[PDB]
C-alpha cells in the first residue's frame, strides 16, 4: 500500500529538553525521577515523579498565551516545534507552506490532558462559585487542544485527530496518523503524544488504587521494570513528536529519513478495566498483527514495562508467546526506569527513543535490575546500553480498558 517515513522527531521529558540530550541520558542509564515539587506532596503516600524542572513555557509561546494552555500542551508545543524544525518543512515564517497546508494534519494523544486545570477550576467553582471559573479553563484542558494549538502554531489544516486510549494514547495517535495517510486523507501528519498529570488529584488517583511505587526515599531506584522488587509505576511527564510523510513526497522535497513505518496492531482484551488479560492475550494479538504486517526481523523491542506486577509479567508472557519462546524474543528494554511511565505520552516518547536506538545502533537499558524475577526471564538489556545494529524496532503500549497498540518501524 502507500509507504510512510519519519522525517522529523522531537521529545521532552525528565531527562532532556530535546531528543539529543534526552536520548543520551537515557542510553547512559541516568534517571530523571525526583521528588514532587510542582505541588506540596508532603502529606501524600507518593512523593516522587518524573518531573521536568528545567522547562520554560515562555520559550515556546508568548507570555500572554501561556495561561491559555495546560502544561501538557506547553510540552507538546515544544516537542512539535523541535520535530517540525527538524523536518525542514517550515517556511521562512516557521509555518507549513500554504500549498501543503491542506494535506498535512495532526494526530495528538493524551490520556487525560489538562487535569491540573480541571482540578484548579473545580476548586475555584467549589469555593467562590461559577463566576470564578477562568474563561481559558476548557480550551486549556481538552486533550484535542494539543492538535488545536499545534495546528494554529504551524498552520496545518489537514485531518485534526485525537486519541485518548489511556496509557496507549501515544501509540494509537501514531497509528491513526498512519491510517489517514494510507487512505490518502493526508500526505503528512504531525504526531504528538503529551501528558502532564503531576498534581494532587493525579497522584492521589493512582495511589488510591495502589498503582504507584511508594519507594519515596529512593526516587532513582523506584522505577524498575521487570525487576523482582518492582512495586508500582512512577508517574512521568513529557511529550514526544514525529512527522510522518508519504515516501515519495519526502523524497521529492529532499527529506531526512529516520525510518519507514512498517506495521501496526490494535486489540482489546475485553477482560478487565485495569488488570491485563491473562497471559497478555490481547497484547499477543496486537503484537502478532504488527509483526505479520511489517514482515521484518525485529531486532529490538521497547516494552510498555511500567514497573507494575501485572504489566511486566503479562507483557513478558505475551512476548515469549508471540516470538514462540524466550530464546526467540529480541532484546527488550523498558525506558520507564529512566523517565518514569509517561502515560498517554509514553507511546510517542518510546517511538522516538526506539527509532533513535536504531539510528545509532545503541539499545538503551532497563535500569535498576538488581534481583532477577524468575517469571520475567527475558533479556532486558540490564543496566548498561548494548551496542547492536538492528534493522527494525517494535514499541508496545497498553491502556486501562484493556486497549492495546503496537507499532513497528524499520530502517530506511
Amino acid at each position: 500500500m502507500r509507504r510512510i517515513v519519519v522525517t522529523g522527531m522531537g521529545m521532552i521529558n525528565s531527562l532532556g529538553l530535546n531528543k539529543e540530550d534526552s536520548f543520551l541520558a537515557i542510553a547512559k542509564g541516568e534517571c530523571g525521577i525526583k521528588h514532587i515539587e510542582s505541588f506540596d506532596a508532603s502529606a501524600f503516600p507518593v512523593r516522587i515523579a518524573g518531573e521536568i524542572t528545567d522547562f520554560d513555557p515562555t520559550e515556546v509561546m508568548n507570555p500572554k498565551d501561556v495561561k491559555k494552555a495546560g502544561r501538557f500542551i506547553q510540552l507538546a508545543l515544544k516537542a512539535t516545534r523541535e520535530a517540525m524544525k527538524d523536518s525542514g518543512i517550515l517556511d521562512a515564517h516557521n509555518r507549513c507552506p500554504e500549498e501543503l497546508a491542506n494535506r498535512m494534519g495532526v494526530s495528538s494523544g493524551s490520556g487525560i490532558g489538562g487535569l491540573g486545570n480541571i482540578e484548579a477550576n473545580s476548586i475555584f467553582c467549589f469555593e467562590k462559585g461559577p463566576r470564578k471559573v477562568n474563561p481559558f479553563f476548557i480550551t486549556s484542558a481538552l486533550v484535542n487542544m494539543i492538535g488545536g494549538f499545534t495546528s494554529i502554531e504551524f498552520g496545518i489544516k489537514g485531518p485534526n485527530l485525537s486519541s485518548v486510549t489511556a496509557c496507549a494514547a501515544g501509540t494509537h495517535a501514531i497509528i491513526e496518523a498512519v491510517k489517514t495517510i494510507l487512505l490518502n486523507g493526508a500526505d503528512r501528519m504531525l504526531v504528538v503524544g503529551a501528558e502532564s498529570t503531576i498534581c494532587p488529584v493525579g497522584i492521589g488517583g493512582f495511589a488510591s488504587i495502589k498503582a504507584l511505587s511508594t519507594r519515596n526515599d529512593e526516587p532513582k531506584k523506584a522505577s524498575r521494570p521487570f525487576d523482582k522488587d518492582r512495586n508500582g509505576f512512577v508517574m512521568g511527564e513529557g511529550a514526544g513528536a514525529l512527522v510522518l510523510e508519504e515516501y515519495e513526497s519526502a523524497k521529492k522535497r529532499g527529506a531526512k529519513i529516520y525510518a519507514e513505518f512498517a506495521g501496526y496492531g490494535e486489540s482489546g482484551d475485553a477482560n478487565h478495566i485495569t488488570a491485563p488479560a491473562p497471559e497478555g492475550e490481547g497484547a499477543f494479538r496486537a503484537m502478532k498483527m504488527a509483526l505479520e504486517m511489517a514482515k521484518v526481523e525485529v531486532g529490538y523491542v521497547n516494552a510498555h514495562g511500567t514497573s507494575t506486577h501485572y504489566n511486566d509479567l503479562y507483557e513478558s508472557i505475551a512476548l515469549k508467546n508471540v516470538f514462540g519462546s524466550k530464546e526467540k524474543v529480541p532484546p527488550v528494554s523498558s525506558t520507564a526506569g529512566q523517565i518514569g511511565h509517561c502515560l498517554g505520552a509514553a507511546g510517542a516518547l518510546e517511538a522516538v527513543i526506539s527509532i533513535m536506538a536504531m539510528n545509532q545502533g545503541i539499545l538503551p537499558p532497563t535500569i535498576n535490575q538488581e534481583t532477577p524475577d524468575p517469571e520475567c526471564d527475558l533479556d532486558y538489556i540490564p543496566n548498561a546500553a548494548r551496542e547492536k545494529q538492528v534493522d527494525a524496532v517494535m514499541s508496545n503500549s497498553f491502556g486501562f480498558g484493556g486497549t492495546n497498540g503496537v507499532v513497528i518501524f524499520k530502517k530506511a
Binding site: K64, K68, P135
Partner: protein
Amino acid sequence: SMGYLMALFEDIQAVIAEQLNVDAAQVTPEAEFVKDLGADSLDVVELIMALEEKFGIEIPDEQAEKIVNVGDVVKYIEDN
C-alpha cells in the same frame, strides 16, 4: 483625589498590560482592546475577570457588554 485617580488608572494599565502581554505604552484611555491592543472575545472577558479580582469589583454582565476602549473600564472602576 487626583492622585487617587492616577493610582487607579496605573493599576488598570498594569492589569490590562499583563493580560494582553503589551507595554503600558499602548494602553492609553483611547486604546481599543481589539483594534489597538490585539485582544479577542476570550481575552476581553478574561481581562474583565481579572479586574473584578484586582479591584474588588463585580461588574454586572450588561455593563461589560459596552466596553470598547480602556477608558470605559477605567471610568466604571472610578464610579465604583
